[PDB]
Design a protein around this ligand. Sequence first.
Ligand SMILES: OC[C@H]1O[C@@H](O[C@H]2[C@H](O)[C@@H](O)[C@H](O)O[C@@H]2CO)[C@H](O)[C@@H](O)[C@H]1O
Ligand SMILES: OC[C@H]1O[C@@H](O[C@H]2[C@H](O)[C@@H](O)[C@H](O)O[C@@H]2CO)[C@H](O)[C@@H](O)[C@H]1O
Ligand SMILES: OC[C@H]1O[C@@H](O[C@H]2[C@H](O)[C@@H](O)[C@H](O)O[C@@H]2CO)[C@H](O)[C@@H](O)[C@H]1O
Ligand SMILES: OC[C@H]1O[C@@H](O[C@H]2[C@H](O)[C@@H](O)[C@H](O)O[C@@H]2CO)[C@H](O)[C@@H](O)[C@H]1O
Ligand SMILES: OC[C@H]1O[C@@H](O[C@H]2[C@H](O)[C@@H](O)[C@H](O)O[C@@H]2CO)[C@H](O)[C@@H](O)[C@H]1O
Ligand SMILES: OC[C@H]1O[C@@H](O[C@H]2[C@H](O)[C@@H](O)[C@H](O)O[C@@H]2CO)[C@H](O)[C@@H](O)[C@H]1O
Ligand SMILES: OC[C@H]1O[C@@H](O[C@H]2[C@H](O)[C@@H](O)[C@H](O)O[C@@H]2CO)[C@H](O)[C@@H](O)[C@H]1O
Ligand SMILES: OC[C@H]1O[C@@H](O[C@H]2[C@H](O)[C@@H](O)[C@H](O)O[C@@H]2CO)[C@H](O)[C@@H](O)[C@H]1O
Ligand SMILES: OC[C@H]1O[C@@H](O[C@H]2[C@H](O)[C@@H](O)[C@H](O)O[C@@H]2CO)[C@H](O)[C@@H](O)[C@H]1O
Ligand SMILES: OC[C@H]1O[C@@H](O[C@H]2[C@H](O)[C@@H](O)[C@H](O)O[C@@H]2CO)[C@H](O)[C@@H](O)[C@H]1O
Ligand SMILES: [Ca+2]
Ligand SMILES: [Ca+2]
Ligand SMILES: [Ca+2]
Ligand SMILES: [Ca+2]
Ligand SMILES: [Ca+2]
Ligand SMILES: [Ca+2]
Ligand SMILES: [Ca+2]
Ligand SMILES: [Ca+2]
Ligand SMILES: [Ca+2]
Ligand SMILES: [Ca+2]
Ligand SMILES: [Cl-]
Ligand SMILES: [Cl-]
Ligand code: NA
Ligand code: NA
Ligand code: NA
Ligand code: NA
Ligand code: NA
Ligand code: NA
Ligand code: NA
Ligand code: NA
Ligand code: NA
Ligand code: NA
Lengths: 135, 135, 135, 135, 135, 135, 135, 135, 135, 135
Amino acid sequence: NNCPLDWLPMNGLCYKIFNQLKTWEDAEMFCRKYKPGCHLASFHRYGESLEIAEYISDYHKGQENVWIGLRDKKKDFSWEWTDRSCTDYLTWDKNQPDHYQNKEFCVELVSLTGYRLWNDQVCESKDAFLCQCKF
Amino acid sequence: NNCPLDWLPMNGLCYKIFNQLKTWEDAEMFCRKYKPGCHLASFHRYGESLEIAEYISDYHKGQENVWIGLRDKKKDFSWEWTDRSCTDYLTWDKNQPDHYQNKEFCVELVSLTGYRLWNDQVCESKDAFLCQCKF
Amino acid sequence: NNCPLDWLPMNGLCYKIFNQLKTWEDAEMFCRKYKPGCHLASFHRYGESLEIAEYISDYHKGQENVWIGLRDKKKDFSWEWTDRSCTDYLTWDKNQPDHYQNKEFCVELVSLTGYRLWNDQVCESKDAFLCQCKF
Amino acid sequence: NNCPLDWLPMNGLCYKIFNQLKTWEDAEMFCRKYKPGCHLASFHRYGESLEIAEYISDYHKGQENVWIGLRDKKKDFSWEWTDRSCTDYLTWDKNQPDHYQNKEFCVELVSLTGYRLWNDQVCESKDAFLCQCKF
Amino acid sequence: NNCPLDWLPMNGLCYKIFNQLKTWEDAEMFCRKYKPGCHLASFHRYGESLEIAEYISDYHKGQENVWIGLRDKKKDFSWEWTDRSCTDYLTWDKNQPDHYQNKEFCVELVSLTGYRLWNDQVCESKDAFLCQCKF
Amino acid sequence: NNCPLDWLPMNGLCYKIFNQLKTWEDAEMFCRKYKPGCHLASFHRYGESLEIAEYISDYHKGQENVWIGLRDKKKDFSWEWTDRSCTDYLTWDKNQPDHYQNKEFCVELVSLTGYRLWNDQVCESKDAFLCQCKF
Amino acid sequence: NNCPLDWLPMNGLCYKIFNQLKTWEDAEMFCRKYKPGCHLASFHRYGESLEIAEYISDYHKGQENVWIGLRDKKKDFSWEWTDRSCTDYLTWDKNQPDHYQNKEFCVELVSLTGYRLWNDQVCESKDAFLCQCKF
Amino acid sequence: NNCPLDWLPMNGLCYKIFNQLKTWEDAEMFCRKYKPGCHLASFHRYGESLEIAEYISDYHKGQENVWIGLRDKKKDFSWEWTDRSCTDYLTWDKNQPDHYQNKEFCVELVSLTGYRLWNDQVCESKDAFLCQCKF
Amino acid sequence: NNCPLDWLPMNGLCYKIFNQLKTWEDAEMFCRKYKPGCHLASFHRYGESLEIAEYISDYHKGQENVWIGLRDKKKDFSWEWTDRSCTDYLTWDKNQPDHYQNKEFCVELVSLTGYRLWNDQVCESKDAFLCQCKF
Amino acid sequence: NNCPLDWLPMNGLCYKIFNQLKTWEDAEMFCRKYKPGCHLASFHRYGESLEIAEYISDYHKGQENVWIGLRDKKKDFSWEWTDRSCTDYLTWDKNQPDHYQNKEFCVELVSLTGYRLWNDQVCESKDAFLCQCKF
Ligand SMILES: OC[C@H]1O[C@@H](O[C@H]2[C@H](O)[C@@H](O)[C@H](O)O[C@@H]2CO)[C@H](O)[C@@H](O)[C@H]1O
Ligand SMILES: OC[C@H]1O[C@@H](O[C@H]2[C@H](O)[C@@H](O)[C@H](O)O[C@@H]2CO)[C@H](O)[C@@H](O)[C@H]1O
Ligand SMILES: OC[C@H]1O[C@@H](O[C@H]2[C@H](O)[C@@H](O)[C@H](O)O[C@@H]2CO)[C@H](O)[C@@H](O)[C@H]1O
Ligand SMILES: OC[C@H]1O[C@@H](O[C@H]2[C@H](O)[C@@H](O)[C@H](O)O[C@@H]2CO)[C@H](O)[C@@H](O)[C@H]1O
Ligand SMILES: OC[C@H]1O[C@@H](O[C@H]2[C@H](O)[C@@H](O)[C@H](O)O[C@@H]2CO)[C@H](O)[C@@H](O)[C@H]1O
Ligand SMILES: OC[C@H]1O[C@@H](O[C@H]2[C@H](O)[C@@H](O)[C@H](O)O[C@@H]2CO)[C@H](O)[C@@H](O)[C@H]1O
Ligand SMILES: OC[C@H]1O[C@@H](O[C@H]2[C@H](O)[C@@H](O)[C@H](O)O[C@@H]2CO)[C@H](O)[C@@H](O)[C@H]1O
Ligand SMILES: OC[C@H]1O[C@@H](O[C@H]2[C@H](O)[C@@H](O)[C@H](O)O[C@@H]2CO)[C@H](O)[C@@H](O)[C@H]1O
Ligand SMILES: OC[C@H]1O[C@@H](O[C@H]2[C@H](O)[C@@H](O)[C@H](O)O[C@@H]2CO)[C@H](O)[C@@H](O)[C@H]1O
Ligand SMILES: OC[C@H]1O[C@@H](O[C@H]2[C@H](O)[C@@H](O)[C@H](O)O[C@@H]2CO)[C@H](O)[C@@H](O)[C@H]1O
Ligand SMILES: [Ca+2]
Ligand SMILES: [Ca+2]
Ligand SMILES: [Ca+2]
Ligand SMILES: [Ca+2]
Ligand SMILES: [Ca+2]
Ligand SMILES: [Ca+2]
Ligand SMILES: [Ca+2]
Ligand SMILES: [Ca+2]
Ligand SMILES: [Ca+2]
Ligand SMILES: [Ca+2]
Ligand SMILES: [Cl-]
Ligand SMILES: [Cl-]
Ligand code: NA
Ligand code: NA
Ligand code: NA
Ligand code: NA
Ligand code: NA
Ligand code: NA
Ligand code: NA
Ligand code: NA
Ligand code: NA
Ligand code: NA
């Protein structure tokens, strides 16, 4: 009804992991250009993080990390979602975010954590990615 | 429509009884692989038990017991649903759960009770099963 | 399109008259086996009665009365709907229900009242019937 | 979606102009038998008159007037809608309704006014007609 | 799904930029004649401007401006939407509207502003256009 | 609180039986002049009839009938509520309304029916009355 | 409660007729300074005209007309409400508005019509006035 | 806001235990006559039972049992609430209901269970009671 | 009455201008200490801007600008509301914000724009201010 | 209004910090005795922690830690809220909970963290406390 068969429906939106590897920026443009009304995913509750993590664990083969829509463009710990939603929830991995070497401003789901925790990472890294769309 | 023709729409979700016999664990992952977001069914009110019980008695094939999403992971009688909803409702059959022979940590609907009551059973045993999805 | 094109959409559900003549219980089992989530129809509002009456008058030829889902299972004047919804609405015909000779425990729409009012009738009578479904 | 592609969705219902010419009675019965849950159209606010008027102009060419669901069944200026909705809104053309020569009891949208205003007319006149359905 | 796959679902409606050059009036008629209930788009919220601006930037390349449904038919700065919705939100570009040379009465989204802001333009100019439909 | 302590809160409105005897018109004017936005009560649901019937039985002793806001001003059975709400629910007593002797045009709740059913009565008769107000 | 006892609650706002005589400008400023969130009244549906008309008749005796919030600020028949709401509804008296002798730019409810219909009048005329507030 | 200080607010309603002792019938009439829109309490979810039980334990001194609105007038296990709500939830004590000596048709909260479980009891018994009101 | 009589009710909250002149931070602490749940005002809709502008123009004498709750805490152009609501709406004045000489990090309504548009200003400036509260 | 003047309204409930020092248990029963339905506060999202933290820092008296409704009854680290809401959120301070000296099974907001983080503490120790009510 709300979403096509191969998309995860949650709180009015539809989510899908893509196994293809891309930079954070390339992943966002792809989601946006996939169908009108799409972006890399934004998270707003713990239940979402867990339902999403399990979904990726079941539908994604490999240990590659997954890009999500959070980023720090101003480069000063002001994380914002590409979909323009509120940053009213977080779940950083242990010791994150750390702006490692001052080159990490794009967020990724950490494979080692069952895709449940976030990590700021180099945007030029090649990760799989999670799109979020309205249908 | 809210659900495909052969699914039971109920309080916003869709349910279906599958007659193929599987272990509790394979019944779960089967549901999750039918479509992203599905799980073995969870119950939260008396009306659902009755509705579900009637649906199964009308649509199943055979006289098998049915696996649902409730399971005792810690083995300390701490029942949790695979869909992560709160365990705010329970409807055990007479004298259950009994962790019989300390080898029962999975819940099934009991066929002899017309599929209304629950019973903790051996997870490696095979049963028919009830999936729950959001479309 | 909440319903197939040959069903009447009404307050979240779908309705359809079946002109084949059946006993009250055979009608209920036919609705039940039609598709999951169906029963003989339940009524909860004055507006539903008038809408259903006209629908029946237009799609139901002849003057056979029509079975709906109300019945007195305990034979004690406690009317219940087969869909388990609340009995919070009643529109009995003149001098009904009367449990005539204590042999009438099933409810039908009365052809003579333009299918607006109800009558308790011998359950084994053959009437056309109104199914209700969730799609 | 709320309506088929060939229909106009407005405030919860679906509307379609039919260009076949019919008497008011035949137009009402055609709508009723088109599919369950339909009637000639009722109007309740100025926006609806304006939206319908433009819709007909775009999808109904020619100078034929259009039947709608208002009629004077008691013949004493008691205008009621066939869909049983409230007569809480009227938009009569200049000097209407007038029961001209006591032969006018059905209401049509007047082509010369761009289908904005109403006229009471001989029910046996052949006009195009506007149906309203629930899907 | 609320909209066809190549349309943008937004607050109950569906939007689509058509990359064809037309005068303001031809663009309105094209939308109106597409399916019943469409018009050049109306805007009522800041979030809509941002969402539309981004969508247009991604699905409409080049520098052609885009027609929207606002127009000053009376020519005394009384801006009205073709879909008759209320003019309760405005987002004019710097120093607009200005009725430049008494020849500008139709509104367009300005490419140079990233399609975020509005400008009144000569109605016979050729722009791409944004349709809005209710499905 | 939605209503003063001696008024019955029901579906957004406040109701109160006044145990004073008045003609139908004096009863309407009394309610109207009580506070801005009051009228003799209008009814739209079966649940309201039951709730009101019980309330009146408990707070109005004796056998005097009770005026409600339904009246046939035109005298051709066109029943309208004084609060201008839609006449979309009726619950006439046996064989009513009958315009007995061409002198009955105002409606009252019938004491002998437990204030559940309606009757058209001579407007100059003295009944207690039921006011409805928006606070 | 939604409004004080001395005010009429209608569709979310509160209305009160003031019997003091004032020019249209003084009436608008009195409403604004009465308390934050008030203006002379705006109308958007026929029900409101009818409810307001009766309210004024009951709580405003005498033959004085009543100021409401509609006015032609540009002086070219561009009627706008002081509360910035949409002019989506009009109910002018016979042959109004007429800009009689080019001195009429403010709108009053006409006493001779029972306060149902409107007239454009000399803004400096002393009329009673209707305020609208949020509480 | 919703309820007076000494009442427990839950799901739109207000609840209060009265320490005075009365028969079931006398307790119901008292609630009804206390203020318009009151009855002995009805329960519809487990959380209600527990929040209520705790409230009574804290505000009620003594070990006397508490009457609630459930009863079996037809005397055949058809329990219904005096407030006319659905019987979509139950929580009988161990081995209840038992229609002991065929003289128990009124329900009471069992003090020994911390007022959490129900017991069918003699209606002529003197218990404290829980009223439920709308304000 | 969602608010005290000297406050402006608006979309669930209450607003009030304070004419005393304070630095941006002293204004925020004054709103905070006024009553629990108060801050300098946040804006989220075009309609709020216009309503607040008129309210200020009527209850605020003089031309002192007015502090609102937006500020750039990280001094990096990342504007946040003191009430922690989402920055999903902006209405900057011409050529603002400009961080003039890198000393302006607090936002005020501009008197010259009729209090409609915003300007980033030196936080130590003395302005009147707008509080917002939940009552 | 939703709450009394000296209470903090937040997501439908009312909160207040009490400075009187009490044991965790007496703080709980004190809240329950302030009004039926109250309990020590429960948290379910990051925004509440921040809102509450700020409120307390502004309205308390002293530098005491604050008791909240979370407590480990079974002493097996199974935290439950006194208001019976699900424990779907947690925000422990550094290295907590530690069941230190196996004598800590009650949670307090830590003053040195600006009242944002939690810590399990000795239940017999005294602290300021945060009540939560529904009015
Ligand atoms: O060194 C900081 C760096 O950590 C990376 O993640 C580490 C992780 O913290 C560590 O526990 C694991 O063993 O190896 C990972 C990969 O080196 C992050 O990817 C990076 O963003 C920084 O946070
Ligand atoms: O012995 C515990 C065991 O009981 C099984 O159920 C029994 C049931 O108790 C008995 O009354 C019936 O006749 O036979 C059933 C099947 O042996 C449960 O299936 C099992 O899970 C345990 O609970
Ligand atoms: O007499 C009890 C019996 O009545 C039937 O209804 C009658 C009805 O009263 C009469 O008006 C009509 O002409 O004939 C009907 C059929 O004989 C009911 O159908 C039956 O259920 C009983 O209630
Ligand atoms: O004479 C009453 C008659 O009017 C018809 O309408 C007229 C209309 O008023 C006039 O402006 C136009 O030029 O000619 C129409 C047709 O003669 C109505 O159609 C008819 O119903 C009567 O009301
Ligand atoms: O001069 C009025 C005219 O402005 C056009 O916009 C111009 C703008 O004036 C100029 O400064 C900028 O460099 O180029 C813009 C695009 O041509 C408007 O497009 C036109 O409608 C008038 O308003
Ligand atoms: O006869 C018409 C008349 O009926 C009154 O009701 C009577 C009823 O006719 C009678 O059978 C019963 O015993 O007493 C009723 C109460 O007087 C209506 O009240 C009146 O309005 C007319 O409809
Ligand atoms: O002549 C235009 C003039 O009309 C006034 O209203 C008239 C009204 O039309 C008439 O029916 C009544 O008897 O006398 C009124 C007052 O002369 C309007 O008040 C005025 O504004 C003009 O429109
Ligand atoms: O004897 C059945 C009878 O039980 C009463 O309750 C008992 C309860 O079951 C028992 O465990 C306790 O020791 O004493 C109670 C009082 O005798 C019920 O009150 C009655 O309704 C029956 O169910
Ligand atoms: O020049 C930057 C400076 O501008 C101030 O605003 C000016 C405004 O540009 C001008 O139109 C008006 O006449 O005078 C204002 C005050 O000098 C802003 O107030 C200031 O914050 C900076 O943005
Ligand atoms: O030792 C465990 C104990 O810690 C207390 O908190 C300490 C805190 O760890 C330390 O950093 C700070 O300087 O002093 C605090 C007070 O001693 C907790 O209060 C207590 O509950 C335990 O967790
Ligand atoms: Ca990192
Ligand atoms: Ca078992
Ligand atoms: Ca019968
Ligand atoms: Ca005519
Ligand atoms: Ca221009
Ligand atoms: Ca009568
Ligand atoms: Ca005039
Ligand atoms: Ca018993
Ligand atoms: Ca500036
Ligand atoms: Ca600790
Ligand atoms: Cl009803
Ligand atoms: Cl907006
Ligand atoms: Na999301
Ligand atoms: Na479930
Ligand atoms: Na039904
Ligand atoms: Na209609
Ligand atoms: Na739009
Ligand atoms: Na009413
Ligand atoms: Na208004
Ligand atoms: Na209840
Ligand atoms: Na705000
Ligand atoms: Na809470």
